């Protein structure tokens, strides 16, 4: 029904940032580098064609690959009765929810670097409780989260 918050840690020039959200969001400022990295973090979390690749050594903050990248998004499911997107989410999620937490949901991203193979693997989790998340199931190249969200990217150039 509603986007609420997003947290980003140890990703590019973000070290620990917490941003409140809504359905419509406008980002502006003079940095022009964090503004693009914000949308890249969103694409990594929700876009399968970007997440299809991994994380490089330059994707870690300060290029220190001994730290973990966390990106966590929060939703509000309060209008299940009046909304049909809440049903679209709830029909793919079954069991990861509890009744005491029937109005909040979490989608998380985690990455730890492999020094031997020089690769950063991305693993996704959801859950209602932030201290108990489980892997999103999937077969092959497809994910259960890919069945819900369609991310359309618009750019005048490229």
Partner 1 sequence: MSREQIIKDGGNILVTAGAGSGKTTILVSKIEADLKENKTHYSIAAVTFTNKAAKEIEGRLGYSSRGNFIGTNDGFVESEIIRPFIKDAFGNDYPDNFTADNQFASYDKGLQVLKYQNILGTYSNPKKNFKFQLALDILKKSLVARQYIFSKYFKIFIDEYQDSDKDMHNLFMYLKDQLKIKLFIVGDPKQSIYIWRGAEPENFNGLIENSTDFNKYHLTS
Please tell me whether residue 82 binds a copy of itself under the rule CB under 8 A: no
Tell me how many residues contact a copy of itself (CB under 8 A).
14
CB 79 within 8 A of CB 111: no
**Residues sharing a CB contact under 8 Å with residue 26, sequence separation 6 or more, in sequence order:** none
Alpha-carbon separation of residue 94 from 20, 33, 47, 89, 157 (angstroms): 27, 38, 22, 10, 40
The residues binding partner 1 (CB under 8 A) are 80, 86-88, 90-91, 93-95, 97-99, 102, 112, 114, 116-117, 147
Q: Which does 156 bind (CB under 5 to 8 A by kind): a copy of itself, partner 1, none?
A: none
Q: Which does 124 bind (CB under 5 to 8 A by kind): a copy of itself, partner 1, none?
A: a copy of itself
β pairing state of 104-114 and 132-135: unpaired
Please tell me whether residue 54 binds a copy of itself under the rule CB under 8 A: yes
Pick the closer one to a copy of itself by CB: 34 or 54.
54
């Amino acid at each position: 029904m509603k986007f609420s918050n997003i947290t980003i840690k140890n990703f590019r020039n973000f070290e620990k940032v917490n941003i409140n959200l809504d359905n419509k969001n406008v980002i502006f400022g003079m940095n022009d580098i964090g503004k693009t990295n914000f949308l890249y973090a969103l694409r990594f979390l929700l876009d399968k064609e970007i997440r299809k690749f991994g994380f490089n050594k330059s994707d870690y903050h300060k290029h220190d690959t001994s730290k973990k990248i966390e990106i966590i998004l929060t939703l509000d499911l309060s209008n299940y009765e009046k909304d049909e997107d809440t049903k679209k989410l709830i029909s793919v999620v079954k069991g990861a929810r509890t009744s005491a937490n029937a109005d909040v949901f979490y989608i998380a991203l985690e990455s730890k670097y492999d020094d031997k193979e020089l690769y950063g693997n991305i693993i996704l989790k959801w859950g209602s409780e932030l201290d108990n998340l489980i892997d999103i199931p999937g077969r092959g190249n497809i994910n259960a989260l890919d069945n819900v969200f369609k991310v359309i990217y618009i750019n005048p150039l490229v």
